[PDB]
């Protein structure tokens, strides 16, 4: 019945595609053609955080919009003070191969991970003045690509074994194992409600998963390359994906239709990090051509240029209140822009 | 300008000083990427001069060598290579036991040589499995794997042909494949690596000074 099963799967896929086509009736670009275009969004660096020797691979903004955690290949996890350009903490890392870093919503814990297949959770606020690792999470068979915090006790981590997992920090075990993804998952984004999270992989697929359900609900395809960075829309009803195919594409959960494709003829290199702003009007993506572009979400036009990073822009973040942006690049610098 | 901000600035300066001191102490470290095939070559090289990425550290002639074995992770190498981009040299291991593995080993070697990240990164090649290959080549001529081979069934000329075939995939200036053949039974291996490693720094320093 293998042939029958394959035929049934193909028929189901065709039915899904037909339903998606029927649901689509107009283009959002035409809908938002009436609104006034956003003017030239010129930005200037306000501070250049310095003190990484090797190249930076990840950063994360704090809940208070002041402290940010940055990870580089030198093995140092530096918690920054964006306002005063200080170094609150410098946590040495057991393995210098780190690709992701996470800052807990409460602020007490910080997560790091990478080619060591272990997610290290370090407690910043202790009775002693030192920063010690609270717990090392093991069990993944692949390199961790991204991790985000749900609470002080639950963390979601996407690994290189084409899977995601949810860990209870106090228990230290895998409560939920999100599987069923054919590409190496590289990034996950958490909705404000912290119940649905989208993970994008190397098979040009972005899968929506429910925290409580533990099983995939919706799948979005259409990219011509691997997915590198993902970010929910501020309302949590949509998201955007950046891929090596040199373009960013927006998806909506309810519609299940790809809405707009931010592509420019001159731009040809891949995508490392991407994130939305406070209102979702501006979508920031840093590319490999030593530059970052800021796209209008509804106008689909490159309206902002963020230049000054000599090397590849690796990580990008937007503050919780959305007033500032941080771009950490391979040139060992994090630049804060307003 | 206030008090605890002055104390915080003092702590920031102390942290920066400690960070710079740690970085200078990391200057005397040699990062050697290891991207060989895993049939019988990697284990001997790891153990003689001594599941995520495996770091093996050893000191030799005032140099700290750190070998990074990435095998066993079973993932895409396109996400791997860019991380290991600042390594001084790439050690490659080639096993002469199985002729079938030679073709894909050579293809992987060509792919490593042709990466944009490794365009100016030198390669140290290790044709392992000496004695058994010498004993076996008499029974099995180097014809099934390489029909284009037109030479006597001898150990030395066949080894030279293999070395030439491997190094023919360089196709790049400012890069040289330092080739050596180790028995993996009784060797003075690390010393050889040291010599090889030294050259890269000198060459790098030359390009640093503009003398080229």
């Amino acid at each position, epitope marked *: 019945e293998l042939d029958q099963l394959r035929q049934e799967a193909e028929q189901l896929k065709n039915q899904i595609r037909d339903a998606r086509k029927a649901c689509a009736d107009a283009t959002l670009s035409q809908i938002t053609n009436n609104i006034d275009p956003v003017g030239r969004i010129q930005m200037r660096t306000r501070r250049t955080l310095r003190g990484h020797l090797a190249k930076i691979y990840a950063m994360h903004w704090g809940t208070d919009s*002041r402290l940010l955690v940055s990870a580089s290949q030198d093995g140092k996890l530096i918690i920054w003070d964006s306002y005063t350009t*200080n170094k609150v903490h410098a946590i040495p890392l057991r393995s210098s191969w780190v690709m992701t870093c996470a800052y807990a919503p409460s602020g007490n814990y910080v997560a790091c991970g990478g080619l060591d297949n272990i997610c290290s959770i370090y407690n910043l606020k202790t*009775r002693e*003045g030192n920063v010690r690792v609270s717990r090392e999470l093991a069990g993944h068979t692949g390199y961790l690509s991204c991790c985000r915090f749900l609470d002080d006790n639950q963390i979601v981590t996407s690994s290189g074994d084409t899977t995601c997992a949810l860990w209870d920090i106090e228990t230290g075990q895998q409560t939920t194992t999100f599987t069923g993804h054919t590409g190496d998952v590289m990034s996950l984004s958490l909705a404000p409600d912290t119940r649905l999270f989208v993970s994008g992989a190397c098979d040009a697929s972005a899968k929506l998963w429910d925290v409580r359900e533990g099983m995939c609900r919706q799948t979005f395809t259409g990219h011509e390359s691997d997915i590198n960075a993902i970010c929910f829309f501020p309302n949590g009803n949509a998201f955007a994906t950046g891929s090596d195919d040199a373009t960013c594409r927006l998806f909506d959960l309810r519609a299940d239709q790809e809405l707009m494709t931010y592509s420019h003829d001159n731009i040809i290199c891949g995508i490392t990090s991407v994130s939305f702003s406070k209102s979702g009007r501006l979508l920031l993506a840093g590319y490999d051509d030593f530059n970052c572009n800021v796209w209008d979400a509804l106008k689909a036009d490159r309206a902002g240029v963020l230049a000054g990073h000599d090397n590849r822009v690796s990580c990008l973040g937007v503050t919780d209140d959305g007033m500032a942006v941080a771009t950490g690049s391979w040139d060992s610098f994090l630049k804060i822009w307003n | 300008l206030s*008090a*605890e*901000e002055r104390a915080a600035l003092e702590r920031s300066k102390a942290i920066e000083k400690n960070l710079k001191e740690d970085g200078i102490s990391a200057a005397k470290d040699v990062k050697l990427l290891l991207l060989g095939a895993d049939n019988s070559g990697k284990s001997t090289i790891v153990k003689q001069m001594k599941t995520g990425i495996v770091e093996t550290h050893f000191t030799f002639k005032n140099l700290h060598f750190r070998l990074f074995d990435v095998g066993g992770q079973r993932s895409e190498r396109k996400k791997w290579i860019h991380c290991f981009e600042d390594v001084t040299a790439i050690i490659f291991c080639v096993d002469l036991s199985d002729y079938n593995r030679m073709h894909e080993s050579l293809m992987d070697f060509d792919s490593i040589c042709n990466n944009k990240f490794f365009i100016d990164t030198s390669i140290i090649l290790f044709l392992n499995k000496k004695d058994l290959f010498g004993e076996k080549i008499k029974k099995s001529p180097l014809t099934i794997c390489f029909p284009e081979y037109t030479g006597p069934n001898t150990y030395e000329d066949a080894a030279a042909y293999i070395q030439a075939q491997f190094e023919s995939k360089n196709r790049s200036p400012n890069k040289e494949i330092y080739c050596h053949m180790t028995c993996a039974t009784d060797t003075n291996n690390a010393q050889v690596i040291f010599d090889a490693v030294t050259d890269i720094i000198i060459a790098n320093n030359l390009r640093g000074c503009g003398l080229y």
Partner: single-chain antibody
Amino acid sequence: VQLVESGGGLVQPGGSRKLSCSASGFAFSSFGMHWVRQAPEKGLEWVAYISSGSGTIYYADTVKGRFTISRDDPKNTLFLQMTSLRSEDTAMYYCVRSIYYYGSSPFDFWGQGTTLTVSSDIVMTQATSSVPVTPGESVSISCRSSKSLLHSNGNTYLYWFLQRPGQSPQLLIYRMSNLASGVPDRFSGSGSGTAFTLTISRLEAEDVGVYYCMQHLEYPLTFGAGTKLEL
């Protein structure tokens, strides 16, 4: 974490003796530490401060030019060198930890202290000497400052301390709003420049003591007069 101090004793006037303190289960090289004396019947007052790595060394004008402080990080010890002692320097000495970064909690732990017997700044003024209180009743404690304690950074520097009878002092509120670690949520603090308030809703047992003001706007650390709680 434990801070144990020794070297206190009877000293002839005009002499010189050193006091020492050792810390266990604690990171020493990253903390700026303070020596503070308490008069036998009067309130607390500052003595000296050693920074992290001994970058800066500060003294009080009462002991300026006669007192020195030294930290031995490898020895994990702190030394107070005293000379030219006076009959007015008899006091119970306390050594305190203080770590300085964004959102830190300085002065959170106080040592046991050692007794010593001998043979301009911003003034802290507490109007009320003592207040008779009953359990379950809210009590308000006020501090007044000669100069505004609010800087241009956006936070006001003031600390709240409780003097447990026959025990080391404890930290309650730092920077006017943030409770310390392990303190009950009943305590609260608020106010503004020149008018600073502490409130204890639903007062309970073991809360009796003397309440002290503190400032960090500028170095001299003139403490509050104190307010005794009577059961």
